[PDB]
Design a protein around this ligand. Structure first.
Ligand SMILES: [Zn+2]
Ligand SMILES: [Zn+2]
Lengths: 130, 265, 62, 45, 123, 190, 114, 393, 55
């Protein structure tokens, strides 16, 4: 029931290759080697080049409707997708990169410091803010 | 007054434009079709031809009369031949009509006006050859020459549009909502510009324009529907809406009633 | 082959409208449909396409 | 007739009456007693 | 008093069999010979009208000059199998099988040729 | 007996009987039977473009998809019968005829003339609807608009003969042949 | 020839209840209601007003096949709350909404001159 | 002519006068509904029946021994739509994601966690379409620029029986080799896979019922300037012909060994018009957006191809019989409307026009060309059957 | 003509596909089912149902 990632990146660019409602964006990390590739709903959450977003992951807080108005809300963000990750690739050196697909939305992460944080399970909630 | 609300626009005798707001499309639509198909009416159903020298065949005319619009005001205080305890038919559930046409005027025409009402109306608005024609003989049944005769005898009954189209009093019904595609319940086809190539609807003036600077609203739902209820006669454009609103209700009722009949046991 | 009572497509009556139409032509020399109250093409096509055979059939003897 | 069936059947048929354009067509028809003939030649224009 | 017999008795039109055809030069459009229309590319005779190279069948087909030819060839057959009115006296005819479409309807679109195929009166 | 029986698959109403002489002074008598035949979930139809097809089902007005105007289709053919058939004029007759519908003027489709798709489309924009035919439609079951638009427009359709009920045939041990003793041929003779 | 008699689209035939309710084993607290002689007109309307009782955990409906005028409605609710009830309620909420409608359309009408 | 031209079916008595068969079992018999009729036989012994259900059941037939691949896939509507529903842009909300899960009969009775929760809780086709795919179904693809994050959303990857990435169409659900069907049959069995159809169907067909889809002249018209860019690709192509005709009417060309000076003339004219026509269409192909319905019906793989678009929006093509452009039936000419010895393309049968927009000449040649076609489709039809019959006896 | 192939409990009509029929089904017009039969021997498992079908 813990978090598995926290880091702010900066939109290097936003791509809409023939998609009226979705854009695959990329951005590097502000701390370290860490790049980010992510598809996203430009309609629900607009985003242009050069933005300060905070990306998170982890597993926790059938599928109940709302009613949770009076319940947990690990939604302290403005975009929360659920999906699964498929391949665990190694890009030379000891640099790793996991691939996450959200029921149709692909994603790639890169770096090397979640050697005991990012698991190989299906669980995975993406979060973003500001 | 309360929940959903109406705001009639220009309304006449054969139409009833109006805006229905504060309702779920789901429910608007439901009412939509209910008018189109399940309001009790009154049409000729049984035809007992005696003589017929017309160039048209028996069942061809038979069809014709099935379509001729009859009165259906107090149609609700009549019973379905299926429930009436009378073998076949009677005054308490049917309207009988006569039709005699002798060719005398050396092309004589047969208009729905030429129908008699041989059975006892029991003093209730019903069984009348709805005429809206300028002269006074709406619906030309058929023509005949020199000495061609034609004797019928019609029997009208309740029934609905499900059972047959010859019933539903609706006949075309306009329905639109959110003229400015804000809900994005559509993806406009286009060669270059959707907006310029796609006709703007006369309905766009009772709702506010898009406004570019605004992002896509998502939490918004289909509220408000611009309609128009045309009528063919039988029932007054107003009723063809009321009664509709009501039958749908009667059904929603038994679903709750039928329910009860199943708790005791 | 006579006029069709009510339009197939939508349902609006149209039996009476025959003579009115075939008249607004011969005389008033006329659009006709539009004034006869036949809006949307469904019913429009109804009248504007009828070929009244009954006339010729009627030209036969007994 | 006779022991002479060595004739050709087809000449004279039963005039079509399904539709008007059916009948017209039928009268304006041609035959040809039996890969090149079936072709639409130029001369056919 | 000006038939087709006169259009011929004045040398304004000629009857060209297939053989004689060989040695003449025929002009299509009498006149002529927009980014929409179809691109168009000694004369002795001109064509009454190209849309006359068609026979009864195709004559009822709308824009036969816009379909895959093999299709036109099909409709060319199905027409002889639709319903309508084959005569008006039908009510005094004792023939096995015959069908009449309750209510006919001349088409919303037509061939100028239909005018001689009495099609508008027998859809 | 030499009396005549109404064909087993048939039925209707007598429409005209008549007695008559023969060259040989014999008694000639023909009988005519009538029947109204209604279109059924199987009967064949087609336009004038080799666009033949049969009925798969029949829905009503409610169930039917529709356009704001009210106007609803009488027929719904599949967009798939267009791409490989290539018969485009079909598509054109519709457009043109959707104008001739509104304009009252006869729409000429005649062969090689001076009428174009670009032209008709302009005439259709003067009347009110999309310049290409397409119209918005709301799904007859839910009322919600259709994410797409449709090529809705009046087209001529011939009702080819060949109705199901003249073909439907089923047998289990019926009239056996004589020489062979096998069944007999044809649905008419069972 | 093989087509039913029209009146089979609304009349219940020999011993048949509008409703037949069956418990669903697939998941807990769930049911499938068979509505006889009905359609979207009434189905979708009931389906709808149930995603309104945020106390209903599930609600979809369907027409098995178009030849037959019937339809199945599946409902699942929160703990110790019977769906049948939620069906009643969501069903009643429906009539009221319409009761109001009828009324609001009648006073409105009278105020017309044409 | 197939082991599959006859198959055992489960009987379902229904109303209305007609045999109602499933779509996916269409291509085996090779039927359509334009009037086609079907014969039905009824077993009579207790074993006769068994023999019919244990070896001739439709489910057993899914993988055809003649081409060691299935022989029944998802056709028309179901195919075409399954494609749309898959795109990253395709999203569905609760109200419908529910009525969709309901239509899948095997549904576990569990709504899968939304592919989106943030503002609005939505799902994507890829998600729900997947509820139809049984557990343990592993599928991997790779088209062109396809790599574990398929940019153009190519390829296909399904793990544990859930679509991970890529769009679904003819390639992934057709009567093809890798075929998700071919795989589900092999991995789960005749039964499980046979059910798979109905589901993938029921969900999709339903969805399409609501998303709608159509086609109209509008799908066949080319951009304002493209229709021009083409015209002059025929003009220039016309001169690259007038040019080699001048250079032939001067004996200024050598005979490519083995060919006649004349034949070699054709060989170029033909190769000139063909390459012309080839791009004429290709200009429009890339000129039809990802919204053009006709295009859509081609990508899905449910009907028609490039060629088709071409002949309808660009150039119809060159007509031909017996392999050579419209002959000289009339001494030294195509039609009497032509000057003798005209070897050009406007005479030999090259229809430069598009269906959307043929000239008499073009229109005619074209006919003479098709006429040859119709011919063998009406000859090879029974001679092929003889050759067949022999092999059998 | 008569031995290597003969006319044979069979029926034939017009097909139209139905998108709500399991892959392996085949909708048969009531009319036809009421025509084609099937010789099922009486057995103490189906006597009850058969005596009903017979009535
Ligand atoms: Zn009574
Ligand atoms: Zn109408």
């Amino acid at each position: 029931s813990s978090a598995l990632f926290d880091d702010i990146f900066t939109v290097q660019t936003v791509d809409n290759g023939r998609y009226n409602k979705v854009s695959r964006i990329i951005g590097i990390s502000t701390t370290n080697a860490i790049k980010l590739t992510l598809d996203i709903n430009n309609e629900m959450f607009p985003v242009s080049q050069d933005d300060s977003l905070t990306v998170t992951l982890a597993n926790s807080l059938s599928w109940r409707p709302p009613k949770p108005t009076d319940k947990s809300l690990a939604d302290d963000y403005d975009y929360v997708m659920f999906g699964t990750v498929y391949k665990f690739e190694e890009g030379d050196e000891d640099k790793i990169k996991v691939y996450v697909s959200f029921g149709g939305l692909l994603m790639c992460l890169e770096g090397g410091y979640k050697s005991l944080a990012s698991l190989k399970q299906d669980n995975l909630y993406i979060l973003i803010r500001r | 007054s309360k929940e959903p609300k109406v705001n009639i626009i220009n309304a006449q005798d054969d139409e009833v434009e109006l805006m229905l707001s504060d309702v779920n499309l789901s429910l608007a639509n439901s009412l939509r079709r209910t008018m189109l198909a399940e309001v009790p009416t009154l049409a000729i159903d049984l035809v007992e031809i005696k003589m017929n020298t017309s160039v048209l065949a028996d069942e061809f005319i038979s069809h014709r009369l099935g379509l001729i619009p009859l009165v259906s005001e107090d149609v609700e205080e009549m019973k379905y031949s299926r429930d009436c305890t009378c073998e076949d038919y009677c005054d308490e559930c049917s309207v009988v009509l006569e039709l005699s046409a002798r060719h005398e005027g050396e092309t004589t025409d047969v208009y729905s006006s030429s129908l008699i009402k041989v059975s006892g109306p029991g003093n209730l608005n019903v069984g009348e050859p709805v005429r809206r024609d300028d002269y006074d003989q709406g619906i030309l049944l058929c023509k005949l020459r020199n000495h061609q005769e034609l004797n019928i005898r019609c029997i009208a009954k309740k029934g609905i549009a499900k059972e047959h189209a010859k019933w539903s009093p609706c006949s075309a019904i306009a329905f639109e909502y959110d003229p400015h595609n804000k809900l994005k319940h559509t993806d406009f086809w286009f060669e270059v510009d959707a907006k310029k190539e796609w006709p703007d609807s006369k309905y766009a003036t009772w709702e506010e324009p898009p406004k570019p600077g605004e992002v896509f609203d998502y939490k918004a739902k289909p509220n408000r529907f611009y309609m128009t209820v045309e009528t063919t006669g039988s029932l007054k454009a107003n009723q063809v809406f009321s009664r509709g609103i009501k039958t749908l209700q009667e059904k929603l009722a038994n679903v709750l009633f039928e329910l009860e009949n199943s708790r005791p046991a | 082959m006579i006029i069709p009572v009510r339009c197939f497509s939508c349902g609006k009556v149209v039996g009476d409208k025959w003579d009115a139409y075939l008249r607004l032509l011969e005389e008033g020399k006329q659009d006709a449909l539009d004034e006869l109250k036949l809006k949307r093409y469904c019913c429009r096509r109804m009248v504007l396409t009828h070929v009244d055979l009954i006339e010729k059939f009627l030209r036969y003897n007994p | 007739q006779k022991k002479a069936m060595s004739s050709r059947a087809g000449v004279s048929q039963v005039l079509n009456r399904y539709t008007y354009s059916s009948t017209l067509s039928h009268l304006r028809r041609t035959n040809t007693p039996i890969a090149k003939p079936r072709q639409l030649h130029n001369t056919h224009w | 008093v000006y038939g087709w017999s006169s259009l011929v008795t004045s040398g304004v039109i000629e009857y060209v069999d297939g053989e004689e055809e060989e040695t003449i030069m025929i002009a299509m459009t009498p006149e002529d010979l927009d980014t929409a229309k179809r691109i168009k590319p000694t004369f002795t005779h001109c064509e009454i009208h190209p849309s006359m190279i068609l026979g009864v069948a195709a004559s009822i087909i709308p824009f036969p000059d816009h379909n895959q030819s093999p299709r036109n060839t099909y409709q060319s057959a199905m027409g002889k199998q639709a319903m309508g009115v084959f005569l008006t006296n039908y009510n005094v005819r004792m023939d096995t099988m015959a069908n009449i479409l309750y209510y006919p309807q001349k088409p919303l679109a037509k061939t100028q040729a239909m005018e001689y195929l009495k099609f508008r009166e027998l859809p | 007996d030499a009396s005549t029986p109404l064909r087993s698959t048939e039925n209707g109403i007598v429409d005209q009987v008549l007695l008559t002489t023969n060259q040989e002074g014999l008694k000639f008598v023909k009988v005519r039977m009538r029947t109204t035949k209604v279109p059924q979930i199987g009967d064949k139809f087609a336009s004038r473009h080799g666009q033949k097809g049969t009925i798969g089902v029949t829905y009503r007005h409610e169930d039917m998809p529709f356009s704001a105007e009210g106007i609803v289709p009488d027929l719904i053919i599949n967009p798939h019968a267009i791409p490989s058939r290539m018969t485009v004029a079909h598509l054109i007759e519709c457009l043109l005829s959707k104008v001739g519908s509104i304009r009252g003027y006869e729409g000429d489709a005649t062969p090689f003339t001076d009428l174009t798709v670009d032209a008709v489309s302009n005439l259709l924009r003067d009347n009110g609807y999309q310049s290409r035919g397409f119209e918005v439609m709301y799904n007859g079951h839910t009322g919600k608009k259709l994410m797409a638009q449709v090529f809705f427009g009046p087209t001529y359709y011939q009702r080819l003969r060949h109705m199901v009920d003249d073909k439907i045939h089923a047998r289990a041990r019926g009239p056996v042949q004589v020489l062979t003793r096998q069944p007999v041929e044809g649905r008419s003779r069972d | 020839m093989n087509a039913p008699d029209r009146f089979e689209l609304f009349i219940l035939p020999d011993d048949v209840p509008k409703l037949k309710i069956t418990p669903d084993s697939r998941v807990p607290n769930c049911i499938i209601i068979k509505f006889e002689r009905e359609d979207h007109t009434l189905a979708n309307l009931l389906r709808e007003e149930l995603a309104l009782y945020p106390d209903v955990t599930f609600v979809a409906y369907k027409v098995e096949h178009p030849l037959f005028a019937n339809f199945v409605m599946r409902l699942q609710t929160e703990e110790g709350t019977r769906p049948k009830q939620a069906l009643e309620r969501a069903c009643a909420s429906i009539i009221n909404k319409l009761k109001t409608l009828d009324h609001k359309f009648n006073e409105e009408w009278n105020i017309k001159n044409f | 002519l197939h082991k599959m031209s006859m198959m055992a079916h489960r009987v379902k008595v229904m109303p209305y006068s007609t045999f109602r068969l499933n779509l996916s079992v269409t291509s085996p018999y090779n039927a359509d509904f334009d009037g086609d009729e079907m014969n039905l036989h009824v077993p009579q012994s207790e074993e006769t029946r068994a023999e019919l259900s244990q070896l001739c059941a439709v489910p057993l037939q899914i993988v055809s021994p003649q081409s060691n691949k299935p022989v029944m896939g998802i056709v028309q509507d179901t195919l075409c739509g399954v494609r749309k529903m898959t795109l990253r842009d395709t999203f569905i909300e609760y109200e419908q994601v529910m009525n969709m899960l309901f239509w899948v009969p095997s549904w576990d009775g569990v709504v899968p966690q939304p592919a989106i929760l943030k503002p609005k809780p939505l799902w994507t086709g890829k998600q729900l379409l997947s509820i139809a795919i049984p557990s343990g179904i592993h599928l991997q693809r790779t088209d062109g620029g396809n790599s574990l994050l398929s940019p153009k959303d190519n390829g296909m990857l399904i793990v544990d029986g859930k679509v991970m990435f890529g769009v679904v169409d003819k390639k992934t659900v057709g009567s093809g080799g890798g075929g998700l069907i071919h795989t589900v049959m092999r991995e789960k069995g005749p039964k499980i896979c046979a059910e798979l159809f109905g589901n993938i169907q029921k969900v999709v067909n339903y969805w399409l019922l609501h998303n709608g889809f159509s086609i109209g002249i509008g799908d066949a018209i080319a951009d304002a300037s493209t229709m021009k860019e083409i015209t002059h690709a025929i003009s220039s192509a016309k001169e690259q012909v007038q040019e080699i005709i001048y250079k032939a009417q001067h004996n200024e060309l050598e005979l490519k060994p083995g060919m006649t000076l004349r034949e070699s003339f054709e060989g170029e004219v033909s190769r000139t018009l063909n390459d012309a026509r080839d791009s004429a269409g290709r200009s429009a192909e890339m000129n039809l957006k990802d919204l053009n319905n006709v295009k859509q019906m081609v990508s899905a793989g449910s009907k028609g191809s490039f060629i088709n678009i071409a002949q309808m929006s660009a150039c119809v093509g060159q007509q031909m019989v017996e392999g050579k452009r419209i002959a000289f039936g009339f001494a030294d000419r195509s039609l009497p409307h032509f000057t003798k010895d005209d070897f050009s393309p406007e005479s030999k049968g090259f229809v430069e026009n598009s269906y959307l927009r043929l000239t008499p000449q073009e229109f005619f040649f074209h006919a003479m060309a098709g006429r040859e076609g119709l011919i063998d489709t009406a000859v090879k039809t029974a001679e092929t059957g003889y050759i067949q019959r022999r092999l059998v006896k | 003509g008569n031995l290597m192939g003969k006319r044979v409990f069979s029926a034939r009509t017009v097909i139209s596909g139905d998108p709500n029929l399991e892959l392996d089904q085949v909708g048969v017009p009531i009319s036809i089912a009421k025509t084609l039969s099937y010789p099922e021997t009486v057995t103490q498992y189906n006597i009850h149902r058969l005596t009903e079908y017979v009535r």
